[PDB]
């Protein structure tokens, strides 16, 4: 996250870190057994880390649970990142408490200008790289489809939203991949892609979670 703030400890209790030796992606807990992330975060072996704040230090509230099922959207397009969504079934249910909690799926799509919270352990610099120990937070609004398409001509499908600032300076970035955009208590976006980070007129692009509620529910129901 570039231009954000350090989140207060466990203030994003649905935020998880996907680990394959080190942190490589975020994700969001949506029930005690299921995490949603980005399909471009796919790896064949993943440990889900819940209750994290400082990802480099054992603080006592962590739950480390292996990914058992790893299911990318069947229509995920690796070239365009259309349908960039992935579900992970934990090998054991997470123990839900105040520091490890689910976030609701959307009951409807978020309107442009809706304020949201983006979070993750990704790069905090728009030039170069700095990867934080502490979870980072950013308040950012949903942008209109026309503004998102003007930012990225010929690449914004109906399954993508832009969230952020056309003036740049504040954005998700590499390593935030797969993490949450939550608006009014609902997971509306998944960190998907962009042109660099926090550049002028290149806000981050996020998977439009509201398009996938039925796919998510059916996948969980069937697995
Ligand atoms: Ca730890």
UniProtKB/Swiss-Prot annotation:
It catalyses: Preferential cleavage: Arg-|-Xaa, Lys-|-Xaa. Its EC number is 3.4.21.4. Disulfide bonds join 7-137, 25-41, 109-210, 116-183, 148-162, 173-197. Ca(2+) binds at residues 52, 54, 57, 62. InterPro entries: Peptidase_S1_PA, Peptidase_S1_PA_chymotrypsin, Peptidase_S1A, Serine_Proteases_S1, Trypsin_dom, TRYPSIN_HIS, TRYPSIN_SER. Residues 1-221 form the Peptidase S1 domain. Its main location: secreted. The active site is at residues 40, 84, 177. GO terms for molecular function: metal ion binding; serine-type endopeptidase activity. The record marks 171 as: Required for specificity. Binds 1 Ca(2+) ion per subunit. Keywords: Calcium, Digestion, Disulfide bond, Hydrolase, Metal-binding, Protease, Secreted, Serine protease, Zymogen. One of its GO terms (cellular component) is extracellular space. GO terms for biological process: digestion; proteolysis. Its cofactor is Ca(2+). It is found in: Secreted, Extracellular space. Belongs to the peptidase S1 family. This is Trypsin. It comes from Sus scrofa.
């Amino acid at each position: 996250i570039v231009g954000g703030y350090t989140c207060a400890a466990n203030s994003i209790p649905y935020q998880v870190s996907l680990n394959s030796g080190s942190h490589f992606c975020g994700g969001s807990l949506i029930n005690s057994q299921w995490v949603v992330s980005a399909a471009h975060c796919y790896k064949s072996r993943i440990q889900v880390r819940l209750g994290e704040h400082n990802i480099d230090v054992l603080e006592g509230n962590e739950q480390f649970i292996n990914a058992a099922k790893i299911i990318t959207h069947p229509n995920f397009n690796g070239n365009t990142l259309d349908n960039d969504i992935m579900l992970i079934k934990l090998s054991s249910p997470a123990t839900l408490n105040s520091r490890v909690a689910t976030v609701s799926l959307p009951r409807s799509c978020a309107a442009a200008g809706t304020e949201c919270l983006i979070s993750g352990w990704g790069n905090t610099k728009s030039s170069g790289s700095s990867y934080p120990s502490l979870l980072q937070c950013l308040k950012a609004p949903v942008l209109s489809d026309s503004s998102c398409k003007s930012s990225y001509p010929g690449q914004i499908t109906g399954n993508m939203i832009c969230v952020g600032f056309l003036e740049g300076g504040k954005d998700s970035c590499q390593g935030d991949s797969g993490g949450p955009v939550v608006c009014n208590g609902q997971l509306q976006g998944i960190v998907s892609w962009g042109y660099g980070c926090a550049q002028k007129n290149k806000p981050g692009v996020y998977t439009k979670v509201c398009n996938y509620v039925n796919w998510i529910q059916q996948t969980i129901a069937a697995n």
